[PDB]
Amino acid sequence: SNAGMKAADFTYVTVHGDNSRMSRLKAQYTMLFFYDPDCSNCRKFEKLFAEIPAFVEMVENGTLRVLAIYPDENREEWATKAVYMPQGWIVGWNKAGDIRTRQLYDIRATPTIYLLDGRKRVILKDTSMEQLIDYLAT
């Protein structure tokens, strides 16, 4: 979805078998993290994120929810690796497949990151680490 818009809603499953809708995840901020289980760029972002203490603290307290979502079809590889994803992140697979089939987000590459606010409005679209830090630390 475009900046300024209500982020498109979708369902997902986690490895612990909970199915939910994104919109049902309450938090002051939601970061969506579109990733692939085989993606060195995803790993590096994941690694850097954990060494920004403000980010780790907002994650711990629940101020910033990370919803890491795999949108493609390799469910086996996804599951194997989900267990290594950053502690505290919700890690989900769009089992319904509608993110791709309806093109709900323009996932140009992995990772693609969106920041959503309290109403699930898109406040940063397809953004970067620099822009996040700057926005969430000012």
Cβ–Cβ < 8 Å for 109, 39: no
Q: How far apart are CA 54 and CA 51, in angstroms?
A: 9
Integer CA distances (angstroms), 46 to 26, 66, 72, 101, in order: 22, 11, 19, 26
Q: How far apart are CA 81 and CA 110, in angstroms?
A: 15
Record the tokens describing residue 8, joined without a space.
């498109």
Tokens 């990151």 correspond to 113
Q: Where are the domains of the chain?
A: 1-138
Tokens 């079809």 correspond to 73
> Taking Cα atoms as reference points, which of 83, 46, 40 lies closest to residue 66?
46
> Taking Cα atoms as reference points, which of 39, 92, 99, 47 lies closest to residue 65?
92
Record the tokens describing residue 81, joined without a space.
């690796």
> Taking Cα atoms as reference points, which of 72, 55, 71 lies closest to residue 133?
55
Cβ–Cβ < 8 Å for 120, 23: yes
Cβ–Cβ < 8 Å for 125, 114: yes
Integer CA distances (angstroms), 3 to 46, 55, 103, 126, 135, in order: 23, 22, 16, 9, 14
Supply the CATH classification number for the domain 1-138: 3.40.30.10
